[PDB]
Structure 1
Amino acid sequence: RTTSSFRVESFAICVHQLHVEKRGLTAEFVEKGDGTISAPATRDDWQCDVVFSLILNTNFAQHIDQDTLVTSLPKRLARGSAKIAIDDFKHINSFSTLETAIESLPIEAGRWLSLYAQSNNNLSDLLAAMTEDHQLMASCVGYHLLEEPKDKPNSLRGYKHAIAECIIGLINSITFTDPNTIFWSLKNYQNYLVVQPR
């Protein structure tokens, strides 16, 4: 709003805790079309409780506020509810070098996120790539497009509607030192979109 130079431009992620299990999801009896009110079809759902800390690399020189840092952060992360405890607002700050940021996290378990940039052009060279440490993850990394793009009326906000598919790259972990094997950033290559570590 005020400082339109903020430009986070990169981000490092540190997953401190991850638990995944089956819960399902109850919808709310929407109309089937003629006159009858009943629940829609039944789907089965995996979901997770994620505890993590971020360190952003912005371009603005100092902090913002503490009245107006907390009311500037969204409450949503991949349909979840993502929040910070209100007796923990003191550790939000802007340091000026990386190595002084690591001892100001009062959480202390790591697994910073990079990727595995080796030839994995099928599935069999993934399952032959997993059982050595097997704390390893295969997340979503980007979108390989299909269409050009083009445009047609009922888009989100008048923008141009392409059609795409997902990318199933591998995610590894770092005990932690060079800050460019970390610090993901989004790049466009005119045929796909991938978050790359710069």
Structure 2
Amino acid sequence: RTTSSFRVESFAICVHQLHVEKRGLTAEFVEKGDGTISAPATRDDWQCDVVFSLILNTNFAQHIDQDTLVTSLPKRLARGSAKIAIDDFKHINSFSTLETAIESLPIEAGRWLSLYAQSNNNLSDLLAAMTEDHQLMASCVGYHLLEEPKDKPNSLRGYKHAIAECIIGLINSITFSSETDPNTIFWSLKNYQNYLVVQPRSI
């Protein structure tokens, strides 16, 4: 919206805290359909608490700002909130060498993330790898189309609408000691013509 050549091109995730539990999401009153105003149906949820930090390898070989690099932050991550601090606005900096860039993180108790490139043809493949480690996570890394896709009338932002599935994957721990190349970090989106899987740029 200010300089239209940003081109972020990748990102890198560093999970410092993780906490999952059941909390319950109270939905609010709707017009039911017979004559009354009550709440909709009840479910259970699962809510999380992520303290993380990001490395971004863009192409913009120039300083950004100090002020509008705060005003341009979004405020949500998977239905959540996204705040930092007042006094952590002095650790936001840009660099041109990614080995001094992991020195700028003022916490030093984290973990990095990659993808586990071993075959997982059923559920029994994962749990065997999940009982040798008990430190690996699974999530949805991409989608999987059922359609070419097609132009449907009330599609959201009017673009082109398909119908997708979810792609399970496996998430790993990395220390980045002195030798792990960054291609196992810095993930992207590659568009393999029927599935939009996010994987790092080493594969």
- Under a length normalisation based on structure 2, what TM-score does the superposition of the two structures give? 0.95
Q: For the residues of structure 2 that align with 1:57 and 1:84, how far apart are their CA atoms?
A: 21
Q: For the residues of structure 1 that align with 2:59 and 2:166, how far apart are their CA atoms?
A: 31
Q: For the residues of structure 2 that align with 1:152 and 1:105, how far apart are their CA atoms?
A: 46
Q: CA deviation at 1:110?
A: 2.2
Q: CA deviation at 1:97?
A: 0.6
Do the aligned partners of 1:184 and 1:196 also contact (CA within 8 Å) in 2? yes
Comparing 56-65 and 87-96, the one that deviates more: 56-65
Q: CA deviation at 1:2?
A: 2.6
Do the aligned partners of 1:143 and 1:167 also contact (CA within 8 Å) in 2? yes
Q: CA deviation at 1:5?
A: 1.4
Identity rate, percent:
100
Q: Matched residue of 1:128: which SS? A: helix
Q: Give per-residue Cα distances to partners, 1:30-56, cap 9 Å, x unaligned.
A: 110232000000010000010000010
Aligned residues: 198
Q: Matched residue of 2:158: which SS? A: coil
Q: CA deviation at 1:132?
A: 2.1
Q: For the residues of structure 1 that align with 2:120 and 2:63, how far apart are their CA atoms?
A: 42
The residue number in structure 2 matching 1:192 is 195
Q: For the residues of structure 2 that align with 1:63 and 1:32, how far apart are their CA atoms?
A: 54
The residue number in structure 2 matching 1:182 is 185
Structure 2 residues without counterparts, runs of 5 or longer: none
Q: For the residues of structure 1 that align with 2:139 and 2:62, how far apart are their CA atoms?
A: 33
Q: For the residues of structure 2 that align with 1:128 and 1:22, how far apart are their CA atoms?
A: 27
Q: Matched residue of 1:165: which SS? A: strand
Q: For the residues of structure 2 that align with 1:62 and 1:42, how far apart are their CA atoms?
A: 51
Q: Matched residue of 1:98: which SS? A: coil
Q: For the residues of structure 2 that align with 1:197 and 1:3, how far apart are their CA atoms?
A: 27
Q: For the residues of structure 1 that align with 2:75 and 2:2, how far apart are their CA atoms?
A: 21
**CA RMSD of superposed structures (Å):** 0.9
Q: CA deviation at 1:62?
A: 2.5
Comparing 130-139 and 157-166, the one that deviates more: 130-139
Q: Give per-residue Cα distances to partners, 1:78-136, cap 9 Å, x unaligned.
A: 00001111110011111111110111110112211100011111000100111222111
Q: For the residues of structure 1 that align with 2:4 and 2:67, how far apart are their CA atoms?
A: 19
Comparing 72-81 and 169-178, the one that deviates more: 169-178
Q: Which has the higher strand share?
A: 1
Q: CA deviation at 1:157?
A: 1.3
Q: CA deviation at 1:194?
A: 0.8
Q: Matched residue of 2:49: which SS? A: strand
- Under a length normalisation based on structure 1, what TM-score does the superposition of the two structures give? 0.97
Q: For the residues of structure 2 that align with 1:133 and 1:190, how far apart are their CA atoms?
A: 34
Runs of 4+ in 1 over 6 A off after TM superposition: none
Q: CA deviation at 1:148?
A: 1.0
Q: For the residues of structure 2 that align with 1:62 and 1:106, how far apart are their CA atoms?
A: 24
Q: For the residues of structure 2 that align with 1:103 and 1:63, how far apart are their CA atoms?
A: 19
Do the aligned partners of 1:110 and 1:174 also contact (CA within 8 Å) in 2? no
Q: For the residues of structure 2 that align with 1:85 and 1:149, how far apart are their CA atoms?
A: 43
Do the aligned partners of 1:111 and 1:174 also contact (CA within 8 Å) in 2? yes
